[PDB]
Amino acid sequence: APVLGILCGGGPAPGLNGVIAGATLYALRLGWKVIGFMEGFKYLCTGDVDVVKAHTIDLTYDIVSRIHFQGGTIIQTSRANPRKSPELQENVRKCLRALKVRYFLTIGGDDTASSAVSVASGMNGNEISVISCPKTIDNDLPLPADQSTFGFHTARSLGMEIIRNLMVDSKSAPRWFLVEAMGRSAGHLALGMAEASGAHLCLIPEEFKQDEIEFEDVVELVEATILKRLAYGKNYGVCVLAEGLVSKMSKKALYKLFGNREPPTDLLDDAELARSLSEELLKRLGNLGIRITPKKIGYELRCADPVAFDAVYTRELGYGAIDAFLNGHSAALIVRENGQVKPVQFKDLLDPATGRVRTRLVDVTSQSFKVARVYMWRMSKKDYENKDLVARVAAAGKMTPEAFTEKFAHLTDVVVE
Amino acid sequence: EAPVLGILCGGGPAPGLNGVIAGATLYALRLGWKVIGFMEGFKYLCTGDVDVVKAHTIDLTYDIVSRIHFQGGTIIQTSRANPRKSPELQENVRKCLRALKVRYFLTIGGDDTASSAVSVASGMNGNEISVISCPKTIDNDLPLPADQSTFGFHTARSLGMEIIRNLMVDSKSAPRWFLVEAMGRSAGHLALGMAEASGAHLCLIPEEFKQDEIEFEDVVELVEATILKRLAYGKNYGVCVLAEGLVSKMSKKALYKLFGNREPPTDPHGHILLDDAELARSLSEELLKRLGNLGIRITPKKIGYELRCADPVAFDAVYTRELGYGAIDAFLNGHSAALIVRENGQVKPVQFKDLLDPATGRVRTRLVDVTSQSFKVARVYMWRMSKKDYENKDLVARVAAAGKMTPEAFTEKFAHLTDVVVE
Amino acid sequence: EAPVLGILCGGGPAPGLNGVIAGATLYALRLGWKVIGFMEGFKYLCTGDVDVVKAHTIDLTYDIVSRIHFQGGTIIQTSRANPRKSPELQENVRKCLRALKVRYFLTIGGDDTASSAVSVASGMNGNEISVISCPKTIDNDLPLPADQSTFGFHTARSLGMEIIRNLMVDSKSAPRWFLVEAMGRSAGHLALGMAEASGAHLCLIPEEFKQDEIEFEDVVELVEATILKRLAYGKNYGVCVLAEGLVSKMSKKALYKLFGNREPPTDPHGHILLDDAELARSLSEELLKRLGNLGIRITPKKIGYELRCADPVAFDAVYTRELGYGAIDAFLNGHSAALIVRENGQVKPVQFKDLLDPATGRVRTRLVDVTSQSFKVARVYMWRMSKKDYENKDLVARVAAAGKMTPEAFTEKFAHLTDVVVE
Amino acid sequence: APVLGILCGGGPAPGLNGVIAGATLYALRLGWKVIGFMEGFKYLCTGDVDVVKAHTIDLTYDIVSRIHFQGGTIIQTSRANPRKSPELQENVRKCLRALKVRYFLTIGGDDTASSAVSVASGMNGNEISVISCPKTIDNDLPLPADQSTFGFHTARSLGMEIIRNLMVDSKSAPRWFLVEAMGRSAGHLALGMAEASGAHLCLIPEEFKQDEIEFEDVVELVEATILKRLAYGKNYGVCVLAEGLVSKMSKKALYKLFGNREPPTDPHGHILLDDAELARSLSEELLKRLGNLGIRITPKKIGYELRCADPVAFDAVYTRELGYGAIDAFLNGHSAALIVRENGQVKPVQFKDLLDPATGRVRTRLVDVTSQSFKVARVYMWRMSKKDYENKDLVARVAAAGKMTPEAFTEKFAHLTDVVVE
Ligand SMILES: Nc1ncnc2c1ncn2[C@@H]1O[C@H](COP(=O)(O)O)[C@@H](O)[C@H]1O
Ligand SMILES: Nc1ncnc2c1ncn2[C@@H]1O[C@H](COP(=O)(O)O)[C@@H](O)[C@H]1O
Ligand SMILES: Nc1ncnc2c1ncn2[C@@H]1O[C@H](COP(=O)(O)O)[C@@H](O)[C@H]1O
Ligand SMILES: Nc1ncnc2c1ncn2[C@@H]1O[C@H](COP(=O)(O)O)[C@@H](O)[C@H]1O
Ligand SMILES: O=P(O)(O)OC[C@H]1O[C@H](O)[C@H](O)[C@@H](O)[C@@H]1O
Ligand SMILES: O=P(O)(O)OC[C@H]1O[C@H](O)[C@H](O)[C@@H](O)[C@@H]1O
Ligand SMILES: [Cl-]
Ligand SMILES: [Mg+2]
């Protein structure tokens, strides 16, 4: 019987097990033998067939019959990447041929897919067919607008539930939480959590007009919302910040971010965006009775058990991968568009400028973004022109209306309105 | 004086009602509108007594609605009272709305609620009152573009999956079969959604039966074949999800057997009382006679009212916020007698008459599309005897032996089921 | 070779079984023991065929059990197969245990499972095998010191509260009364726990009835009084929780009315089949006849099997870890024919004789203590007519008016209920 | 009718609303008037009765009938503390008499109870009765042993569920998470979450023998656990750290903790331990020492998301009984008492019985590291015990995993048996 091998690459997302079971269960009904490589390409890169065998397992019906309820991945994952070296690529080719892998399914991000195509192109098309399923919790695949990637629904819903507790806590014991939503790629995850939870403010890189963000502008955007809420008798709230703000900041802004120190280098992971904003905002607003606390919402989302939408989603993706193999497809991506799972050749999705799959960002011109902005607390262009409103907000900050306009009014040219 | 927006809910609750109320109210308050809410739908507006209506209306303020987007249910309650049947009731609703000076009237409910809103509007001047309705259903049976859900459906399906997950673990830990009955007779979207997500071994919905009337025996035998095939693979346990809508597709003879070889119950006006039917219990009793000797135990379980007021999941929280905003946008843009729906990621008003089915006069009902790729994929992961499975004699021998019957006896009893349901 | 520890589960699952299996297995593996698990309790050990047993036993390794403490159910399954009835079966179990060289034998189950283990142990030499059983019950009906829970109860009560919370929101959103039936006939701990936690308006458990046999009419009237009092305060909705144990206290006459004025269903041996009873449904049908004219609708809801394999809450995860450790400690200290229980914060073995009730030959059943302060506190927050309430003429007038009857009729019908249930 | 005034103090815990609803509903059945002070003692300390009146609300049936489902507190809370000044204490007394509060219920932890008594001793017990309910997710009130404070079960259960997700993620994508469990008073919460979730290590201040912890010892306790797992083929795990380790650290340890800088301080000269990042600092050090071995280490805080979770059934029943017991203590003439539950009975316990004689403040209940429960929890942790350090084969295996000689490993790590109880 033909052999199907499955591996995972990248960081986990809810529903990985859904894809593994959807592909494996269907393939077993076709009589295929299914194996799974542990930790992605990590051991295939060695080329030692004894080492690979010690870290491959037989994906049987009993193993995969009930993993669709479970977060994470039963065959683990790694970022091991054979595309960098031709020797590593040939080590992967050597082990796959030894195991007679006829069909090769990789579940991972663009890096995982790129490794799969690199191994396949140097291989004969008759012996092995390679398909990859694109995975990302950031919802940044170029699907038709409003169509989500698998894992995104689970991450956003658990994120909403965490922020709900912080909304109740900020009101019960007045304070502001600056929630930092992990992920520097796009603003989908931060905006989704914020809109669902009714957070009072959300800042994503996509809403900044200029190409580089300044640290001062971020502080003042949060500061204006805090003062406006304070002008309405509320000294508390929650503000959600996409970590992607950091990767759009200028060199000078990063210098201030790291404590007016030189930024570390080989390193945006060491940045503490929410904490730095908390310290500065306490200097400016602590005298008003405002306390500010940072909180990151990251790794606890990646292996949450999938919500029903992702369980259905990944089952259909697993079926679609096996279907593509049966129809002779190779070097393709299993994606779902308009309710249909279809193979899509890798380059058809690539951005020529990047060499990687195109990144779908938040469309800040869409009606959905404007609707989300409507329910946020913020100072618009019209608000700065409202003399009564500006007087109350400035008074809340214990400064003159002229001083408030002088400091904050320019922000209407910093972010889309 | 500021314009008055009045809000009411009709029908059975679905998760996210408060989200629509909070979206419409918060935006309206930013526009300076005064917002009021009618308790229990059309119940008191139908009386025509303005004192009774005022005793059951409340002021929807910022403080009230600021955090109800987290909460299931509806803070202004709901009712199925329907003024559309009588012109006296319709004029009573108009009399009370004019008394309260309602400029904008938003109803959140099913088709009966939307129709009542439109009937009240036709007798009213378009300048004095504008009427918008937001379509709500956990059954997902609105005619939106295919694969796009109605609000509350995602919450109901996700909680349904979690309950069935416990029953899946319990069925395997202590071998048994659960017949889960998914509440809702309109369509099979909810039953199939829960079953596919939870990996249930079988799902039966009215949409997959080719004939116009289902027979009670055919339902029993479809489950029986699934139980036996699982038993042929060493598994004497499972979970089967049944859309309650099977009952409403059943023939007269089938309903007689369903109610215990009794005369089906009827209401005072002659409508058969299908709420008193217990599909999962009746099928379990029949299957226990046939399969108990094999070591099979079967238990019914209903998944109903615990879904309706579950707190909305993030998808519905965003959905109902966008719908509430869209209701206010439609009022500002002069629309009336329209339904706020979301299509391809855009919330827009759609005129009520544009959504009617001309043959019926009512809003068209979207059922499960059993020819779609989604339904075929769901069917693949179910345990069942396909057309090809009945022709595989090695398989038929193993299943027949599991049921303690001859291969010829098995073919005679069950093979006709391939003409009962689409394959 | 290393000592062999064999583990099986019997009876119905409870949350935390896997915690006990992992607690015993992890500690034993650190001691160098070999650990095996029998699938489906005594089911295959009863055959006596050692090849059949080996095909349904698995090696409990570190990798198998390292993370099952998060998971409900039991990875080695369970059954109610019971070898105590026959020594032909008991000796079949003895034959397989000796073949597998089981030095230590741990069973997690009810009284049948514990008794089967000791019966098999009595025929074996004390040097070759030591037998320990961990008592399991989600009903909280073990004779622990009062207010101390059995493992699995905290999880079941908490999930039950969450279900009733959705029904409390739904009953208020769309006015109705839910009659929630908490499955389990041994005691009222589970029904009373869910009701108190969720703030349900009424709870009825068999333990609060003074007489030895309950009448169907009295149960109907106790609910009826609560509905009327709530109706007298403007609330035409609520939730009432009923322990299924009420059925097992009902008189012969009461059971006749319960089953539709029919002869109660019976098994082949002539014993009544109370599982076929539908307590919540029958009470709902009767209460609708009496109260439908008042605008009351009533719906039943069962809370049963979805509790048994829910993932354990933190209290049960810690509990079952300590029980698993205590079983291995008991083996190390030479105990046998003992029950591993936790009392006053200490896991200890307790000899079977200390817990058996001589009148029954089964472990003593701890029921709700209706004289305790905890029960009185729970009753305070219920809606109900007390002795003092019936003597309040102003209150009786309002409740009777809510029921559309004279105060004399109300007192004549309902006042006797103060002698039916403890006050 | 008599007036019952209710306030919440301290950080929120799940079930505050349960106490408010239990006390308010029963008091309303007795015909009492119930009011609630917003934000604890914050406004009562001003002495301005006009301001206090603007921040009190009438606790009615409709307000409280269904808040037993809800986390947080509808009357908010604060750490405002009249205990510090006699000037403030008289301000609270002045406002309470002005509002004619006969019964005064405070819902909070040890600091809140102590503040209530300071107000109580200068007031007549007949004129005003002051009762407090035990609130803390830190479980550090001096209740009868094995009896939890309310909110602890909810916090521990949500903590278990969060750590479960981190457990699946650490195994799926091998890494170590250093979870920092908020709370410096005691180790009940950190140890509870770790035990329920099967975390590989838990460090609480209670298990350190010496009075002052050294930063190097904390780093090495985690390092030994990581290396031992590495010796068994596991390069991933979860370690739970009580934030209270920070408050036991010596002056030198705090200097290293804040980046080899002088610790930040408030205007009075006390160290600002809130600015410390225990898990982050340990992660940086351990990545330097172990990154080459294939170890990735990430810090993670489990704090504020626990405090206002909706209560679990145990806390719902608990706080319902506590609110009832508070009203019962009022009816029976008790004052200056704490409502506690022991053997299924809610009873008042006079405040003085709970004071620590050396301190004058409410005694703080810590983890009893000699108890059987702690020993059982420790057995399921990954760690090097005294007997493990004396096992020559084990030491060779772990040392090889850490790429060091057995002699080097013994020199560095064996002294830890005198650092922490065994
Ligand atoms: N930026 C904002 N976002 C959301 N709501 C707001 C904002 N500013 C004001 N509101 C609310 O919208 C309404 C505006 O009314 P007013 O400020 O009284 O003209 C009030 O209910 C405010 O609390
Ligand atoms: N109707 C079905 N649905 C899902 N899986 C099945 C079904 N029938 C058989 N299987 C599984 O598919 C695989 C192929 O079975 P076989 O017919 O033995 O080749 C085995 O793992 C079976 O348990
Ligand atoms: N049986 C009951 N259980 C709980 N609360 C009640 C009950 N009866 C009345 N109440 C409430 O107790 C308060 C005082 O009642 P009353 O003495 O009638 O004014 C009101 O909030 C009533 O709604
Ligand atoms: N410190 C520890 N805590 C918990 N389990 C352990 C520890 N050390 C080893 N184990 C496990 O306990 C068993 C004892 O292994 P050994 O004593 O080396 O044969 C193996 O399953 C190990 O994985
Ligand atoms: O009940 P088990 O044999 O463990 O398997 C349960 C199976 O149920 C369904 O019918 C699906 O085909 C599978 O996705 C699932 O694995
Ligand atoms: O991380 P794994 O090796 O899969 O196992 C995780 C282990 O962690 C803890 O430290 C306990 O010793 C075990 O109860 C648990 O199984
Ligand atoms: Cl200073
Ligand atoms: Mg404290």
Residues C234-260: b if buried by 16+ CB within 10 A, e if exposed: ebbbbbbbbbbbbbebbeeebbebbbe
Coil, helix or strand for C23?
A: helix
Residue D82: CA atoms inside 13 Å, Cβ hemisphere, count?
29
Please state, in angstroms and as integers, the Cα–Cα distance from residue C390 to each residue in C149, C209, C413, following that order: 36, 19, 11
Could you give phi then psi for residue D58, rounded to 5 degrees? -90, 115
Residue B288 falls within a domain, yes or no? yes
- Residue C19 in contact with residue C317, Cβ under 8 Å? yes
Both tokens of residue A305? 């058990």
Enclosing H/E stretch for B134: strand B130-135
Please give the order of strands across the beta sheet that includes D129-134: D56-58, D33-37, D3-8, D103-108, D129-134, D337-342, D345-350
Chains that touch A (3 or more CB pairs under 8 A): B, D
Give the β-pairing of D56-58 and D33-37. Answer: antiparallel
Residue positions counted in chain D: 422
Residue D18 lies in a domain: yes
Give the CA angle between residues D225, D227, D231 to the nearest 5°. Answer: 115
Taking CA atoms, what residue in D is nearest to C19? D196
| Pairwise CA distance, residues B81 & B85, whole Å | 10
Q: Give helix A367-374 / helix A188-197 axis angle, nearest 10°.
A: 50
User: Are A183 and A318 in a shared domain?
Assistant: no
Partner residues linked to A8 by β-bridges: A107
Identity of the residue in A157, A315, A371 whose CB atom sits nearest the CB atom of B313: A157
Q: Do residues D102 and D4 make contact, with C-beta atoms less than 8 angstroms apart?
A: yes
Q: Give the experimental resolution in Å.
A: 2.8
Question: Which of D84, D78, D67 has its CA nearest to residue D16?
Answer: D67
Quick one: D225 exposed, middle or buried, by C-beta within 10 A (0-12, 13-18, 19+)?
Answer: buried
Sign of CA dihedral C386, C387, C388, C392: positive
Query: What's the CA angle centered on D13, arms D8 and D15, to 5 degrees?
Result: 85
d(CA A89, CA D14): 55
Q: Provide CB contacts within 8 A for A408, sequence distance 6+.
A: A220, A223, A224, A379, A384
Q: A157-174: string of b/e by CB count within 10 Å (b at 16+)?
A: bbbbbbbbbbbbbbbbbb
Residue of chain C whose Cα is closest to the Cα of B311: C166
Helix (H) or strand (E) holding A256: helix A251-257
What's the CA gap between D295 and C267, in Å, rounded? 63
Stretch (H or E) spanning C355: helix C352-355
Give the closest residue to D23 by CA, choosing from D331, D342, D352, D334.
Answer: D331
Q: What angle do CA B274, B276, B279 make, to 5 degrees?
A: 75
What span, in angstroms and rounded, lies between the C-alpha atoms of A380 and A194? Answer: 19
CA gap B192, B241 in Å, rounded: 8
Q: Coil, strand or helix: which one is C350? A: strand
Closest C-alpha among C73, C43, C68 to residue C55: C43
C-alpha distances (whole Å) from B277 to each of B202, B281, C260 are 21, 9, 16
Q: Nearest CA to C392 among C209, C227, C229, C210?
A: C229
The chain C residue lying nearest D328, using CA atoms, is C377
In Å, how far are B54, B85, B96 from B47, measured between CA atoms?
Answer: 12, 14, 9
Q: Which of C165, C380, C392 to mutate to test the interface with D (most CBs of D within 10 A)?
A: C380
First to last CA, chain C: 63
Positive or negative, the Cα torsion across A171, A173, A174, A175?
Answer: negative
Using the 8-state DSSP alphabet, how is residue D150 labeled? B
- Structural domain contains residue D89: yes
The C-alpha atoms of residue A33 and residue A2 are separated, in whole angstroms, by 6
Whether A29 lines ligand 5, by a CB cut-off of 6 Å, is no
C-alpha R_g of chain A:
24
Alpha-helix runs per DSSP H in C259-313: 279-291
Residue D76 near residue A172, CB atoms below 8 Å: yes
Q: Which residue has the tokens 């340990």?
A: D282
Q: Confirm or deny that A110 is annotated as ligand binding.
A: yes
Mention every residue, 6+ apart, whose C-beta is less than 8 A from residue A244.
A183, A184, A185, A186, A187, A190, A204, A205
Residue numbers in A near D300 (CB within 8 A):
298-300
Q: Are residues B246 and B124 in the same domain?
A: no
Taking CA atoms, B188 is separated from A328, B141, D114, in Å, by 35, 9, 61
Residue B289 CB contacts under 8 Å (≥ 6 apart), including other chains: none
CB B163 within 8 A of CB B170: no
Q: Identify each DSSP E strand in B22-67 by its residue range.
A: 34-38, 57-59
| Closest to A384 measured CA to CA, from A415, A409, A413 | A409
Interior angle at CA C296, CA C295 and CA C299, nearest 5 = 145
Residues followed by a break in chain A (C to N exceeding 2.5 Å) are 266
Residue ranges with strand state E in B156-254:
177-182, 202-204, 238-243
- Could C305 and B40 be called an inter-chain contact, meaning their C-beta atoms sit closer than 8 Å? no
For residue C408, tell me if it sits in a domain: yes
Same domain for B298 and B316? no
**Residue showing tokens 């003159």:** A400
CA neighbor of D318 nearest in space, from D141, D134, D150, D154 = D150
Kindly state the helix (H) or strand (E) to which residue B359 belongs, with its residue range: none
Cα torsion at D20, D22, D25, D30 (round to 10°)? Answer: -110
Contact D300 A295 (CB under 8 A): no
DSSP letter, residue D420: B
A332 is a domain residue: yes
Query: Within a domain: residue C369?
Result: no
By three-state DSSP, how is residue D62 classified? helix
CB B157 within 8 A of CB A307: no
Based on the domain organization, do B82 and B186 belong to the same domain?
Answer: no
Q: Is D352 exposed, middle or buried (0-12, 13-18, 19+ CB in 10 A)?
A: exposed
Q: How many domains does chain A have?
A: 2
H helices present in D265-391, as ranges: 278-290, 313-331, 372-379, 386-389
Does the distance separating the beta carbons of C166 and B310 come in below 8 Å? yes
Atom from ligand 2 closest to the CA of residue B395: 17
Q: Is residue C373 in a domain? A: no
Report yes or no: D150 and D315 within 8 Å, Cβ to Cβ.
yes
B292: which 2 tokens? 């108990």
User: Which atom from ligand 6 is nearest to the alpha carbon of D234?
Assistant: 3
Using an 8 Å Cβ cutoff, are D6 and D27 in contact?
A: no
Mark the breaks in chain C: residue after which each occurs, C to N over 2.5 Å.
Answer: none
* Contact criterion met (CB below 8 Å) for C104 and C3: yes
DSSP state of C79: B
Say how far apart CA B416 and CA B217 lie, in whole Å.
12
Structure tokens at C17: 């079984």
Residues in chain A whose beta carbon is closer than 8 A to a beta carbon of chain B? 22, 25-26, 29, 65-66, 68-69, 145-146, 153, 156-157, 159-160, 164, 167, 192-193, 195-198, 307-309, 311-312, 315-316, 319, 338-341, 366-368, 371, 374-375
Subunits next to D (3 or more Cβ pairs <8 Å) are: A, C
Half-sphere exposure of A200 (CA within 13 A, CB side): 29
| Contact: C169, B299; criterion CB under 8 Å | no
Distance (Å, rounded) from C-alpha C35 to C-alpha C26?
9
With beta carbons under 8 A apart, name residues in chain D contacting A298: 300
Contact pairs from chain B to chain C, CB under 8 Å = 93
Residues of C in contact with B13 (CB under 8 A): 170, 173-174
List phi, psi (to 5°) of A241. -125, 120
**A173 and A56 in a common domain:** no
- Catalytic residue check, C147: no
Burial class (CB in 10 A: 0-12, 13-18, 19+), B359: exposed
Cα separation, D139 vs D135, whole angstroms: 8
Of all ligands present, the nearest one to the C-alpha of C202 is: 3
In this structure, are strands C338-343 and C346-351 parallel, antiparallel, or unpaired?
A: antiparallel
- Please state, as a whole number, how many other Cβ atoms lie within 10 Å of the Cβ of residue C386: 14
Half-sphere exposure of B355 (CA within 13 A, CB side): 25
**Residue D253 sits in the same domain as residue D395:** yes
What residues of D act catalytically? 138
- d(C-alpha D210, C-alpha D420), whole Å: 8
- Torsion sign, CA atoms D193, D197, D203, D209: positive
Q: How far is D214 from chain C (nearest CA, A)?
A: 31
Alpha-carbon distance of C325 to C340, in angstroms, equals 10
The C-alpha atoms of residue D107 and residue C102 are separated, in whole angstroms, by 55
Claim to verify: residue C164 and residue C275 sit in the same structural domain = yes
Residue B106 φ/ψ region, left for φ over 0, alpha for ψ in the -120 to 50 degree band, beta for the rest: beta
Domain that holds residue B399: 157-308+385-419
CATH of the domain at D177: 3.40.50.460
Q: Rounded to whole angstroms, how far apart are CA atoms C35 and C286?
A: 55
Q: Which atom of ligand 5 is nearest to the CA of B238?
A: 1
Phi, then psi, of A373 in degrees rounded to 5: -65, -30
- Report whether A119 contacts A89 (CB < 8 A): yes
Whether D237 has a binding-site annotation, put simply, is no
Are D126 and D16 within one domain? Answer: yes
H-helix or E-strand spanning residue C200: none
Structure tokens at B144: 């939106």
Separation of alpha carbons A280 and A223, rounded Å: 10
CA-derived radius of gyration, chain B = 24
User: Looking at the domain assignment, is residue C86 inside a domain?
Assistant: yes
C275 is in an annotated binding site: no
Amino acid at the residue A347: K
Q: Which amino acid is at D113?
A: A
> Three-state SS for B155?
helix
CA dihedral B96, B98, B103, B107 (to 10 degrees): 30
My answer on whether C56 and C124 are in the same domain is yes
Give the integer Cα–Cα distance in Å for B269 and B114: 25
Take atom 8 of ligand 2 and give the residue whose Cα is closest: B383
Compute the C-alpha angle D112/D115/D119, nearest 5°.
Answer: 140
C-alpha C177/C-alpha C167 separation (Å) is 9
Instruction: Measure Cα distances from C253 to C205, C241, C418 in Å.
Output: 19, 23, 21
Do D29 and D53 have their domain in common? yes
Rounded CA-CA distance A277/A294 in Å is 8
Residues with CB under 5 A from ligand 8 (ion): D 109-110
Nearest CA to D409 among D390, D418, D233? D390
Q: Are D109 and D209 in a shared domain?
A: no
Which helix (H) or strand (E) segment holds residue B121: the answer is: helix B111-122
Q: How far apart are CA C64 and CA A364, in angstroms?
A: 49
DSSP D7-29: EEBSS--TTHHHHHHHHHHHHHH
Shared-domain flag, residues A80 and A10: yes
Task: Estimate to the nearest angstrom the gap between the alpha carbon of B150 and the chain centroid.
Answer: 10
Contact between A295 and D301 using a beta-carbon 8 Å cutoff: yes
C275 close to C302: Cβ distance less than 8 angstroms: no
For residue B34, CA distances in Å to B3, B25, B31, B104, B109 come to 6, 9, 9, 10, 22
| Helix H or strand E encompassing C422 | none
Closest CA to A297 of A129, A160, A112, A131: A160
The sheet carrying B202-204 orders its strands as: B202-204, B238-243, B177-182, B298-303
Q: Is D110 annotated as a binding residue?
A: yes
Q: Which two tokens stand for residue A247?
A: 């990767």
* CATH code, C317: 3.40.50.450
- Angle value at C-alpha A366, between A361 and A369, nearest 5 degrees: 80
Q: What residues of D are in the A interface, CB distance below 8 Å?
A: 11-12, 16, 39, 70-73, 76-78, 162, 165-166, 168-169, 171-174, 177, 298, 300-301, 303-309
> Running DSSP on this structure, what letter comes out for residue D143?
P
Nearest-angstrom CA–CA distance, C177 and C172: 9
What positions of B carry a catalytic annotation?
Answer: 139
Contacting residues for A375 by C-beta, under 8 A, at least 6 apart: A195, A198, B23, B26, B27, B321, B325
CA distance B204 to B181: 10
DSSP helix/strand/coil, C302:
strand
DSSP C137: -
